[PDB]
C-alpha cells in the first residue's frame, strides 16, 4: 500500500500492506456448490491459520475500522485464501558512511513462529510476481531502485524454520541536501573571502567576517546532527563541512598573519591579500572537484 516513513534516527521504516496467505485444508473441502465462499471475517477465529510473523518488526497491527481488516475465501477443494491489512514498523540498520549519497537495503523477514519445516513450508505465490505495488511507494526523500524475493530455511536450536525475505534498495535523493546543506555551506565559504577585498586597516570588519563565517558553519552542523543517530563514524556530509570549516578558519588566520606584519612589512601584507583572492577560491574549487568525484 505504502511506505509512510523512513527514520535514520530510529533506524526503521513503516510499511502498510495487504498480506495474503494461501494453503489447502482438506477438512474445509465442500461439494454441491460451484462457488467460492467468501465468509464474514469473524470465521477466522474458528479456523487454523499459519503462525506467520515479521522477524524484524518493532511494532505491528492489523487495521481495525470498520471491522478487523481480514478476509477468508474458501474454494471447493479446501483451498483457503486468508488476507490481512497490516501496518508494521520494521528495523533497517543503515550504513550512513556515504550519507546523504547513500543506498540502503531495507528488508521484511517473514517466518513461521512455532512450526518447523517438518510442519510448514513457505513460498512466494507467483514467484517473482508475488509482491505488487512497489510503484505505489512515494517517498519524497527516496526512490526504490530494485526489489528482490528470497526463500531460505533458517536453523535455530528449536529446529529449522521457513523464511521468506522481501528486500528493497532505496536511493536517497540529493536535492533536499543541496538546497538546505551544501549550498548554505558553499555560500558561507564564499562570504569568508569578501574579507580579502576589505582594507587591512578595517580590523573589526575583517575579524567580524571571519567570526561570523566560522560560527555559521557550526550552526549548519548542529541542525544537520539534530535528525541523525549518534553514530561513532564520519559521514560524507561531515567530511564536506569539515573541509568548509578549514577554509573559513584559514581565512581568519590569514587576517591575523596580515595584521601581524602590515606595520613593518606593508608590501608583503598587501601581496598576501592579493594572492588570497585567487588561491582560496581555486583551492575550494579543487576541494569540491575531489569530493564530488569520490562520492558521486
Amino acid at each position, epitope marked *: 500500500a505504502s511506505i509512510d516513513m523512513v527514520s535514520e534516527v530510529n533506524m526503521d521504516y513503516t510499511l502498510t500492506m495487504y498480506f495474503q496467505q494461501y494453503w489447502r485444508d482438506k477438512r474445509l473441502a465442500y461439494s454441491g456448490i460451484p462457488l467460492n465462499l467468501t465468509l464474514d471475517n469473524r470465521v477466522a477465529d474458528q479456523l487454523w491459520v499459519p503462525d506467520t510473523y515479521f522477524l524484524n518488526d518493532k511494532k505491528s497491527f492489523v487495521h481495525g475500522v470498520t471491522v478487523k481488516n481480514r478476509m477468508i475465501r474458501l474454494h471447493p477443494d479446501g483451498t483457503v485464501l486468508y488476507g490481512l491489512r497490516i501496518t508494521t514498523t520494521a528495523a533497517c540498520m543503515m550504513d550512513l558512511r556515504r550519507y546523504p549519497l547513500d543506498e540502503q537495503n531495507c528488508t521484511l523477514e517473514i517466518e513461521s513462529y512455532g512450526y518447523t519445516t517438518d510442519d510448514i513450508e513457505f513460498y512466494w505465490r507467483g514467484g517473482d510476481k508475488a509482491v*505488487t505495488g*512497489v*510503484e*505505489r*511507494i*512515494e517517498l519524497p526523500q527516496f*526512490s*526504490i531502485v530494485e526489489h528482490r524475493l528470497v526463500s531460505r530455511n533458517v536453523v535455530f536450536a528449536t529446529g529449522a524454520y521457513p523464511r521468506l525475505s522481501l528486500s528493497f534498495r532505496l536511493k536517497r535523493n540529493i536535492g533536499y541536501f543541496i538546497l538546505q546543506t551544501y549550498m548554505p555551506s558553499i555560500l558561507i565559504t564564499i562570504l569568508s573571502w569578501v574579507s580579502f577585498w576589505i582594507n587591512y586597516d578595517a580590523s573589526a570588519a575583517r575579524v567580524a567576517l571571519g567570526i561570523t563565517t566560522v560560527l555559521t558553519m557550526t550552526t549548519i552542523n548542529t541542525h544537520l546532527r539534530e535528525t541523525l543517530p549518534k553514530i561513532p563514524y564520519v559521514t560524507a556530509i561531515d567530511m564536506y563541512l569539515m573541509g568548509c570549516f578549514v577554509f573559513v578558519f584559514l581565512a581568519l588566520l590569514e587576517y591575523a598573519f596580515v595584521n601581524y606584519i602590515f606595520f613593518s612589512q606593508p608590501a608583503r601584507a598587501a601581496a598576501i591579500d592579493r594572492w588570497s583572492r585567487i588561491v582560496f577560491p581555486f583551492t575550494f574549487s579543487l576541494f569540491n572537484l575531489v569530493y564530488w568525484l569520490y562520492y558521486v
Partner: nanobody
Amino acid sequence: GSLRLSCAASGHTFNYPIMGWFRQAPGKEREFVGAISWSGGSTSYADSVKDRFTISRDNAKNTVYLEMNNLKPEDTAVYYCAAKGRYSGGLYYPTNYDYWGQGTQVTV
C-alpha cells in the same frame, strides 16, 4: 527494427502518478504492455515484452516513451497510452485507468 513511441501529458499529473501502455489486437481484449511512475521512474512490463521493449520518461517535457526494440508479427495492435490515479488498483487492469490517448495503429 527499432522504434520509439512517445506519449506527452498535460494537466493534473500529480493526482495520476502512473502512466500505462496498453495494446488491442483485432478481436482480442485490451492487453497490458508496461507502466511507469512519473516520480522515481519505477517500471513494470508484461512477460511478452520483457527484455525487448523499454519505457522511460522526462518530467521536464511531461513525456513518456515506449522504445519498441526487437519487434515481432505478434506485436500488431492499436497501442494506447493511459493514466492511473493514486488509489485506483492493480497496474494490469485497463478499467483502473482514466485518461486514454487516441491510439496509434502499428503493423509489421
